[PDB]
């Protein structure tokens, strides 16, 4: 073929990824719906913080996608114990993620699978959202989605309550969880089930009421929980300034409508405050 295959990089439920010459190839229902989703979405998107689809090809019902090859992802950086995550590094990662998400939401697409392993880093320190196999277009009044999206540790409470219709809040909550993981170096809300995920959410952030979530009882899978006080944000994040705590609170608001959008998050004082985001070439490489 046109690509000189070099090295195995991993395997998935839909395709296997290999590095080739530098690019990465992800190789009676017909062509896989997830691959078609990735193709159709990444052909219409072009932003420095979104993974670029360079080429696509295949044979019969089998198909392969060509992407730019990425060095690492946020999961490896977080799990690396020799990588000190300074506030500037965290701000840089958050800024790139939010700019990619702002571009994606502008074009009315929800990633719906945001997590540290889906935020890839290249050799130039540029963060790109990847794994668009769950991404979907939003804003239509009839495209009923499923609440079984987003990995559980990063799933928003409205999804865990069975929200069919939702907006950018599902991505914003995952962004908040990624920020919490960046600050704590461990998953913020590591549930073992949907009920345990909701229990951890309410134990850490307090059980929301109608003050903070006016229509929470209308969600089909809503279940009344015990009233927890919630650990205050400055307790959880003892090394976070007031601006970062404000950003975290905005990202973790229980009301999806009141939850800050990518644009509003980017306009927050945290990103414009000292210190500035670390330049991509200076970010740490695991």
């Amino acid at each position: 073929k046109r690509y000189e295959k070099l090295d195995f990089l991993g395997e998935g439920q839909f395709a296997t990824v290999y590095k080739a010459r530098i690019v990465a190839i992800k190789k009676k229902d017909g062509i896989n719906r997830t691959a078609l989703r990735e193709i159709k979405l990444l052909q219409e998107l072009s932003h420095p913080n979104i993974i670029g689809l360079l080429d696509a090809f295949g044979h019969k019902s089998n198909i392969s996608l060509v992407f730019d090859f990425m060095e690492t992802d946020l999961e490896v950086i977080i799990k690396d114990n020799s990588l000190v995550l300074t506030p500037s590094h965290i701000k840089a990662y958050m800024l790139m993620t939010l700019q990619g998400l702002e571009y994606l939401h502008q074009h009315w697409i929800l990633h719906r699978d945001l997590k540290p392993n889906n935020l890839l880093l290249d050799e130039n320190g540029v963060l790109k959202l990847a794994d668009f196999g769950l991404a979907k277009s939003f804003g239509s009044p009839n495209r009923a989605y499923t609440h079984q999206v987003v990995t559980r540790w990063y799933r928003a409470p409205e999804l865990l309550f069975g929200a069919r219709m939702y907006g950018v809040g599902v991505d914003m909550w995952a962004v908040g969880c990624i920020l919490a993981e960046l600050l704590l170096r461990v998953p913020f809300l590591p549930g073992d089930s949907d009920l345990d995920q909701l229990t951890r959410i309410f134990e850490t952030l307090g059980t929301p009421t109608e003050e903070q979530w006016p229509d929470m009882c209308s969600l089909p899978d809503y279940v009344t929980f015990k009233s927890f006080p919630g650990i205050p944000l400055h307790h959880i994040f003892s090394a976070a300034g007031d601006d970062l705590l404000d950003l975290i609170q905005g990202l973790f608001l229980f009301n999806p409508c009141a939850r800050i959008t990518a644009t509003q998050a980017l306009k927050m004082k945290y990103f414009s405050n000292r210190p500035g985001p670390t330049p991509g070439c200076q970010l740490p490489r695991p």
């Binding site: 062509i31 078609l36 219409e44």
Partner: protein, 279 residues
């Protein structure tokens, strides 16, 4: 979004001459391939256009009776797939009957209209082994269709722009007291616009606006102040004249469109089956 879409950048063409050039190139390239493999058996490009129109209405009929109900966006995507495929391919190499079903199948996948292959092929009015053979051919041609579309699968239809224009008219244009009575007729014009090559020549917003304005003209309401004042084209005379002549070209395209004739498509169908009998 359309303004940075693949439909605008790669599949919106400047003139009908460009489309005719592409179709003639496809027909001549197939003729060269066939004579290299080895003449009244060959089809002329106008005959190919007539057959493509016949099978586009066949695709419309298939999508209209499809259970579960096909969303109109899926039908638009499938028809655009058909048009794009036969811009650069000949019906004598790839039979339009299979290609239209492959277009519907790919559109159902792309527009997230989750439908199983058995229930897709059950809509076909064939025998169980006939439907199975049709499914086999669709799976054979799905990758070919995707490759010929150059992996550009998102199709921007005029329906959402039409709804947005109706919202804008209801909000910012009180002179037209009820934009809703402009709907059905405009939709009719929309369908007529879909029959021509306008989808490959103009933006979906322009198509929707042209349909709405033709509907307004039919009802006798002349409301050029919507373009002049509400969309503020009185601040840009060049843009206003450009929009007006685009819509006039749309209406000319619709008026000069010719439906295929039954005896003509019969003869061309015999010729097409003869071409697909052997090479």
């Amino acid at each position: 979004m359309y303004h940075n879409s693949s439909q605008k950048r790669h599949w919106t063409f400047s003139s009908e001459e460009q489309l005719a050039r592409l179709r003639a190139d496809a027909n001549r390239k197939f003729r060269c391939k066939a004579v290299a493999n080895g003449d009244p058996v060959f089809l002329e490009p106008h005959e190919e256009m007539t057959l493509c129109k016949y099978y586009e209405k066949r695709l419309l009929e298939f999508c209209s009776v499809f259970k579960p109900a096909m969303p109109r966006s899926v039908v638009g995507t499938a028809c655009m797939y058909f048009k794009r495929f036969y811009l650069n391919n000949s019906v004598m190499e790839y039979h339009p009957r299979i290609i239209m079903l492959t277009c519907a199948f790919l559109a159902c996948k792309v527009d997230e209209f989750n439908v199983s292959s058995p229930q897709f092929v059950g809509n076909l009015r064939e025998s169980p082994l006939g439907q199975e053979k049709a499914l086999e051919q669709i799976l054979e041609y799905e990758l070919l269709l995707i490759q010929q579309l150059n992996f550009h699968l998102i199709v921007h239809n005029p329906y959402r722009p039409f709804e947005g224009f109706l919202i804008d008219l209801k909000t910012r244009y009180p002179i037209l007291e009820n934009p809703e009575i402009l709907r059905k007729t405009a939709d009719d014009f929309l369908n007529r616009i879909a029959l021509t090559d306008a989808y490959l020549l103009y933006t979906p917003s322009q198509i929707a606006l042209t349909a709405i304005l033709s509907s307004a003209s039919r009802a006798g309401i002349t409301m050029e102040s919507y373009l002049s004042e509400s969309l503020m084209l009185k601040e840009n005379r060049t843009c206003l004249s450009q929009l007006l002549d685009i819509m006039k070209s749309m209406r000319n395209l619709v008026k000069k469109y010719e439906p295929p004739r039954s005896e003509e498509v019969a003869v061309l169908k015999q010729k097409l089956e003869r071409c697909h009998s052997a090479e």
